Point group: none
Chain length 147, copies 8
């Protein structure tokens, strides 16, 4: 189940993470107390994982973003590249994929020259070849969809 | 233009977008009023683009996710694709990209058959060839970094 | 459910489609009557779809096999290429795929020159571009696996 | 060397691999003995490679299927890959192929996570890079053609 | 249908297309008349397609040679390309090919600027994209093999 | 120089390698003796290298032709692959190239299965990776052009 | 001819474009008058075309450089893209090439977002598709070599 | 840090690297001393990297130029390639690059055979595969832009 009182709830919270427990209950058709409980059970079972403000990465000094596709060099070694790159803070996302490469990373960085640095560090730390695709512009990002 | 105080606020709001104004105040050593007003300045400039609950896409029924790279079947018609795809709700992100392809989308769907139907809708609404890379697992995503 | 009397049954029938209703029941641990009923319910619900002898295609005049990957040319038209190629007998399999192309076909043919013919016919009949990969040798084929 | 009679037998056994010897006899206009003995000749020469029940892979739990093209991480060591992959039961077929890649496998698995684990096993047991093409739907397969 | 005698004749005429009928006669152990008439049979069937002096392309002024692979800018219009390129004299060969491209040409020209002008003529007369592979040196060519 | 009495001469001999020393001199505007001398100096300085009949390779058992592109595996070893493959008779041409690969071969062979054999032999004898492109049809071949 | 008094002269001027007419003549072994004349005849016949200081493009606001490979969309139109892009100042170099694309440009730009702009302008002004490769770092550039 | 005056100086020295100090002075409205000293500041900071005569590569005997993209045969050994190629004089530039390849070189040579010999030297001194793109014509190059 995902009871569809919760459908409207997660819908509302995806468009507005600061939407107040009060103003939810009006559009939501429940008691300020019922809503508040729902929202708490939704986090407990992992339906909402977190609340985040969406930061413009340019405004914070990240003028170059890229997908970096990686493939381990040695298949006789354990394939743990996500755990090995997890400490590198400019990797924002890491996915295993069915494609040409084993994983895809999304990475943000100060400039073209910093990307070269980061790639050398990704290569030597995980034990991977890199193939990168530079993002020129983000038209929209995390528009979460609740059916 | 971003001082040390704004850096703390954007960093905390990244870690927790429901942080109360009083909690932010006592972490930045300001009054609740000075916090509110600094947060509002951030919002009206580029810096904070909104606030979102992070929803588990598996729990709402998106069991398959994919990257889809797209390129114009005919590269004359000036480039429309992000605008025209904006009304497909299963597209969650859209980036233009350097290299052989012009945009990369991330898309979320219920199953393999729903992925085929969606790739058709994308080919036809943007007039585009598609190359799809199914995601097998997300190790971590959205982990925002304030330098 | 797939009751695992049926596991051994489908296992046995995948290795030997002519295995007799008799000799099954010994290895199968059931009455010749029980087995015979099982096997009949297995076909009714679509678990076994057919029985086929495996024909060597070289021995029958098919000296060249190929995967032919296809993508419709016009995405404003209905995408019905499987139904349109279904009458072409040298297409042995047709799959929709998540990749560079929309579908993959496996095709068998008398020679390199007949492949060129077949491709021109696939192109004009479905409305598709073709990309083909020639099979040099089949090491093994349909080794069906029952967990 | 294949006369008209053998053509009828291989065609009927393709359409129905459990056809009884008497049914084959009366369709070829032979005795049941002459059928048996012609069928046995077909089997001992190249022509009929075995008989198999066609199992629905979704009903036994293989909900994901994929093509995986593989190429040697080091193309010296003489080519071993089909032999070494023979003991991975989720590989159902293996073809060598002309072009940039050396073999194409068809593989069947329970889910996305089981696909990642399998691609690891394949990279390591054959020492190979992999490029994966997930299948979304089978419109028809195995439809054998006797000219 | 090719006996041992025809094999000797086609092999000698491969090594030396000006071999005199008497020289061929005494090598096949036939009369000059039986040679003539066997050679004529070869010519009127598929077997001998003509006779050519092998010219040094550098000595007549073709200092640059290249392979050009071509693919239709629009793959509907049924395939015309070999017919339409037949009247460009600098194209010396034309093969259709499996894979991503549809034909491969070998082309010979006086210089780099004459190569650019020719690639334009090819793009426009066949309506095709081109991918060019310049030849640096011919180690041996045309070495025909009669098994 | 290539005196353009020789232009017509090499032109005539490229279209007809058996064209008689007699019938040349009429179209050629010279004495049967002058022509005969020209032709002999043309072979001496390497302008005409040979005379060959053009054999249909299908008719002689070569039902599959391919370009096979090769690149040495070890760049610390001398790069002598042309000299090492020269004894393999099914390689009809070998070129060094400016492209993705170091050389391109044209190869003819009895079937798809024989190609696989030949490739394994090319790999182990030169020390090369292979990438092959199968020829489906030859529209025309060695139309030599004399400006 | 390039008299090899001129070899040393052009060698000297390639390493140092401001090298004085005086200090040349010492290392150069000529009269300050002879050198001065040489240098003037060298510019007249186009051996030296110009003198330029080498500007760091980062230092001047060009934080992102790229090769942009282009191919005209319509081969029935005159192919004049160099003349059409010549007014766009961020194109620093334009070459016709033998490859996948018709031309290669080197382009410099303020950022990733400005590159997207520039590409849209290259597309609509010449009539071309674009494929771009981002330069991460220049290790060395115009080391001119005089044999 | 670059004022309006420095912009004029770098722009004029781009157009003419032999401009005399007095000519620069009267264009910037400064004394010859203030010019010298501003030019020296530019040189000692990043801004002016040297001065070069632009030599016609055809007139000194480099009749063939090419882009060569290179990628490590083994991507572990930390990346050495620019350092190791620095001593090959026919390499004029070296850039690292995002995407499938790691560096792009521009190379100049006397002929096709000298290009093959050079690609060998490059494969072996950096341990790299190469992909070559011959240049047919330079329409304009080095046209520096000060914004
Ligand atoms: N993929 C192109 C850029 C297209 C920009 C968005 N239409 C190059 O590289
Ligand atoms: N892909 C290679 C053939 C490899 C044959 C099997 N190891 C060419 O084309
Ligand atoms: N390249 C196509 C074949 C085209 C046949 C000639 N028009 C596949 O593979
Ligand atoms: N081509 C790699 C970058 C390599 C950086 C230089 N070794 C990605 O994209």
């Amino acid at each position: 189940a995902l009871d569809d009182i919760d459908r409207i709830l997660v819908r509302e919270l995806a468009a507005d993470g600061r939407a107040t427990l009060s103003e939810l209950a009006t559009r939501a058709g429940l008691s300020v107390s019922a809503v508040q409980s729902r929202v708490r059970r939704l986090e407990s079972r992992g339906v909402v994982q977190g609340y985040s403000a969406r930061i413009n990465p340019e405004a914070v000094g990240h003028l170059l973003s890229a997908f970096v596709a990686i493939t381990p060099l040695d298949p006789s070694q354990p394939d743990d590249a996500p755990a090995r790159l997890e400490h590198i803070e400019e990797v924002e996302s890491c996915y295993s994929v069915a494609g040409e490469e084993s994983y895809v990373l999304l990475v943000r960085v100060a400039s073209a020259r910093a990307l070269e640095d980061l790639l050398q560090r990704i290569r030597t730390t995980a034990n991977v070849r890199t193939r990168s695709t530079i993002i020129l512009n983000t038209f929209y990002s995390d528009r979460q969809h609740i059916p």
